[PDB]
């Protein structure tokens, strides 16, 4: 998080949405769940924040 | 002094489940390192003299 400025990328995509607090935990790699599986999935790879 | 602003714990836990992806499963790691014949040998293979 403290080195973000020093990391150069081709681009960044910002994905915007409203999710229930308890379901925030599903917004991660290696996850399963109603959101992780049917609404919004992330690849098991490196990401920004 | 936690949870004051910018206090963090340097350690974190592994959530190891029996129902997750392989990359997220636990592995036991053993790393062998040899001392290459400085002092007189203490370990040798199954050889005859």
């Amino acid at each position, epitope marked *: 998080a403290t080195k973000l400025n020093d990391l150069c990328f081709s681009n960044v995509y910002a994905d915007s949405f409203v999710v229930k607090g308890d379901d925030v935990r599903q917004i991660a790699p290696g996850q*399963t769940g*109603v959101i992780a*599986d*049917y609404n919004y999935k992330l690849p098991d790879d490196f990401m920004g924040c | 002094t936690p949870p004051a602003l910018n206090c963090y714990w340097p350690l974190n836990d592994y959530g190891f489940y029996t*129902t997750t992806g392989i990359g997220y499963q636990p592995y036991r790691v053993v790393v062998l390192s040899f001392e290459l014949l400085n002092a007189p040998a203490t370990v040798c293979g199954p050889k005859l003299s």
Partner: antibody
Framework: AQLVESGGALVQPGRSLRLSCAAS????????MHWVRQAPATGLQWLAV????????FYADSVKGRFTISREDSKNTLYLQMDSLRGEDTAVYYC????????????????????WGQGTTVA | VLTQSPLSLPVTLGQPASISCRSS???????????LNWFQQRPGQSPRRLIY???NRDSGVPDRFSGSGSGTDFTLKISRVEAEDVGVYYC?????????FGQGTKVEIK
């Protein structure tokens, strides 16, 4: 996780019968509930499921529209309302659920079915 | 639809046995897993699970129980069949709704 069925009886074709199943050893509210029946005719036949929130109810075509599945969380009890019973419906009715609710959503509650009651005879 | 074979398995006490299950369709689910389980129902008792996800065993299940398989073709294996292993072994698929069971294999001890 223990399931205890009751309500089995002999009922003439055309009439109705209502089963119940008491749960103990686990939190009833946190699991989906199923009915499965056993007979030489079908072996083990899945009939219906009601989800943990009591909202979604799915039925096998063989009972769809004739049987209704329901639950009373306040009594930790699963029910099955069987209307217009036929001779073909003779079977031992088992109360079935799961121990693992890690993925409490469709269709994952059909994957383990590892908790079974003693079963009650309906004729 | 699941079909098991043999319908009845005549195994001498202390000898190994296996039960076959064949599906009308691949039991590989949309997430790549396979939801093919095996249950044993002992006379006077309800069904209990022994093997799940083709080859995993439930806690409390003797190490003599194992299994393997893929696609449509699955097998339940018992390294040695004991007197207490008498019962009907069912295969179950949860991959395709409605979930289904095989007709069950009656394993008896000779």
């Amino acid at each position: 996780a223990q399931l205890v069925e009751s309500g089995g009886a002999l009922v003439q074709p055309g009439r109705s019968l209502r089963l119940s199943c008491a749960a103990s050893g686990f939190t009833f509210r946190n699991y989906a509930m199923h009915w499965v029946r056993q007979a030489p005719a079908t072996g083990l036949q899945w009939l219906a499921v009601i989800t943990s929130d009591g909202r979604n109810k799915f039925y096998a075509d063989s009972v769809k529209g004739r049987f209704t599945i329901s639950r009373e969380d306040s009594k930790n009890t699963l029910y099955l309302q069987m209307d217009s019973l036929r001779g073909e419906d003779t079977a031992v009715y088992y109360c079935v659920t799961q121990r693992d609710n890690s993925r409490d959503y469709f269709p994952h509650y059909f994957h383990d079915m590892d908790v079974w009651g003693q079963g009650t005879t309906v004729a | 639809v699941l079909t098991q074979s043999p319908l009845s398995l005549p195994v001498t006490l202390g000898q190994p046995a296996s039960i076959s299950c064949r599906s009308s369709q691949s039991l590989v689910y949309s997430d790549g897993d396979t939801y093919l389980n095996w249950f044993q129902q002992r006379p006077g008792q309800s069904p209990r699970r022994l093997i799940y996800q083709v080859s995993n065993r439930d806690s409390g299940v003797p190490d003599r129980f194992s299994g393997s398989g893929s696609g449509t073709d699955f097998t339940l294996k018992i390294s040695r069949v004991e007197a207490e292993d008498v019962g009907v072994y069912y295969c179950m698929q949860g991959s395709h709704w409605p979930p289904t069971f095989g007709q069950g294999t009656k394993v008896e001890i000779k």
